[PDB]
């Protein structure tokens with residue numbers, strides 16, 4: 278039936294790190310260029326709709342969400358790391374432990390730790406440019422929807438939803454979904470909802486809008502007691518200040534299938550309807566998949582068609598930002614199934 | 624002069640193969656030959672009697688460290704292996720700025736909650752070695768409490784970066800803090816802990832930060848530039864009843880003994896004003912001009928001068944071994960402090 282436009286960057290390997298700290302070893306990263314290659318190949322093979330490259334928006338709309346100091350650090354981090362004589366990729370070794378001061382130091386190792394929440398997200402040559410391109414992909418999709426499209430697929434790589442205003446991690450650097458939501462707001466959309474269906478909690482998006490009532494943030498995810506990001510995402514985090522009751526976390530345990538997960542989806546859609554937003558950003562991960570190598574939900578490829586159909590029933594202008602999903606064999610089928618389901622495929 | 628040394632062969636149970644350094648997993652800097660080389664110099668110089676530690680149990684450890692943290696260190700490795708991880712136990716995630724200081728269930732979450740860095744791998748035997756190292760410090764404290772002027776606790780792993788419930792910087796139990804608290808528990812009214820290791824003793828500072836009965840002083844490289852980065856600045860003077868009972872003295876790269884010893888003199892005057900009943904010296908020789916991870920310029924002969932100055936404080940004194948990573952000179956440097964204390968120049 279319907280068609281949906283996809284925005285992508287041709288340089289899938291602009292970010293091309295070779296190490297990820299995992300179980301005490303430095304392994305090949307889970308978040309690989311072939312993730313974007315495979316999704317794009319399936320977008321073309323299914324003729325989802327027009328494919329386009331991103332427009333350059335510059336750092337202005339990125340800085341509506343992220344701090345100036347953080348954006349500067351990501352641009353210079355690799356250069357400074359190399360200049361200090363380190364021989365691996367840029368990985369934090371030390372951080373602000375409990376009892377220490379949240380105080381920005383001068384040394385590159387100190388800044389790396391100050392600005393991170395994990396050691397599994399290496400930085401190297403090209404990472405800065407890749408983060409910038411991924412944010413432009415998100416902003417191009419947002420522009421397409423603002424200028425008339427019902428929906429658009431921002432094929433973001435690297436993902437974004439773990440990044441705070443000034444913290445990177447969980448393979449994320451710029452919070453593409455938050456940048457898209459803030460762009461809707463800046464363009465006069467009074468209220469925006471960001472719905473996070475990636476397997477992991479969107480802690481970055483929660484933190485960015487936590488004290489605000491004009492952006493509703495909702496995430497379904499695996500229990501942070503058991504999985505990343507561990508220290509946010511619990512159901513008692515409902516917002517702060519004016520943002521009280523405008524954040525909603527819905528947690529699930531291991532082996533949760535679509536029959537159960539979709540009940541949380543319905544609760545999220547009901548909260549969205551009450552909020553009555555003017556635009557919707559969906560932070561889409563397919564790491565809820567039953568074969569995902571780092572996650573523990575049990576969705577099947579066919580369930581993603583049902584997910585897309587239910588999201589379309591919200592009846593809102595919708596930007597999809599690509600987040601996680603690490604079984605590369607199925608990542609294209611799974612992600613494009615959501616878009617096809619949104620466009621009417623059953 | 625003579626000084627007794629306490630040493631445990633169980634330190635060898637701490638023998639990890641990997642350290643995250645500059646984005647790579649390398650052979651660790653804090654390796655067993657450090658302790659063995661110091662011990663051989665103790666024997667070579669006939670410094671004094673060499674004793675093995677008594678077992679004091681977890682009680683004196685738990686006077687400073689939380690029960691949950693002590694329990695975590697005992698089970699960490701087994702939980703890591705049972706969860707299917709194939710490397711040594713290394714934190715990957717932690718409580719980032721903006722997140723909740725909330726203890727999770729999963730082993731990765733607990734590892735991150737209890738840590739300040741990823742350069743301190745845990746493997747089999749780390750628990751046993753950390754326990755033996757605390758007993759080494761407590762045996763040295765007992766020797767001094769029962770009549771010795773001073774004693775050398777040849778601790779490995781070191782301790783001064785360990786908070787009540789945080790490990791890191793190669794440290795698990797804060798041996799110096801445990802010895803200090805033992806003095807206090809035995810009726811010594813006031814105790815000073817003087818940290819001459821190159822790095823800030825952030826764990827010792829944190830443990831006593833709100834207390835005026837234990838004065839904590841550290842000389843160290845500028846944390847703006849070096850580990851631990853997020854504590855050790857001169858404006859950290861204590862909290863609550865502890866305000867004015869913590870003193871950090873910071874130095875820049877290439878600082879020689881002629882400058883470092885001015886900071887030492889300031890520390891000694893602060894101790895003299897405090898008038899403690901006992902002194903614990905957290906001793907690192909990573910202030911040495913050839914230390915591979917530090918940037919001060921002390922010579923081996925300067926350690927004789929350091930030990931002489933410490934003896935002039937006239938206090939019952941426990942030395943706990945902390946850092947120092949030029950293994951060629953680590954024995955000469957550390958034993959020079961003890962020999963300078965006992966009167967050698």
Ligand SMILES: CN(C)c1ccc(C(=O)NCCCCCCC(=O)NO)cc1
Nearest residue numbers: 447448475477505562570571600601602
């Ligand atoms: C069994 N195994 C090999 C693993 C299990 C869990 C992780 C992990 O959570 N890593 C931290 C990154 C989680 C978030 C990734 C980015 C994402 O999709 N966010 O939604 C890794 C490996």
Ligand SMILES: CN(C)c1ccc(C(=O)NCCCCCCC(=O)NO)cc1
Nearest residue numbers: 792793820822850907915916945946947
């Ligand atoms: C040039 N190079 C090879 C290095 C430079 C610095 C470190 C480091 O600070 N690592 C963090 C550990 C610092 C504390 C070590 C334990 C200690 O001595 N505490 O006093 C490592 C390597």
Ligand SMILES: [K+]
Nearest residue numbers: 473475477497
């Ligand atoms: K989620």
Ligand SMILES: [K+]
Nearest residue numbers: 486489492523
């Ligand atoms: K909110």
Ligand SMILES: [K+]
Nearest residue numbers: 818820822842
């Ligand atoms: K020190």
Ligand SMILES: [K+]
Nearest residue numbers: 831834837868
């Ligand atoms: K104090």
Ligand SMILES: [Mg+2]
Nearest residue numbers: 384385386848
């Ligand atoms: Mg450094």
Ligand SMILES: [Mg+2]
Nearest residue numbers: 568604606607
């Ligand atoms: Mg398969």
Ligand SMILES: [Mg+2]
Nearest residue numbers: 503729730731
């Ligand atoms: Mg885990």
Ligand SMILES: [Zn+2]
Nearest residue numbers: 475477562601
């Ligand atoms: Zn995810």
Ligand SMILES: [Zn+2]
Nearest residue numbers: 820822907946
């Ligand atoms: Zn040191």
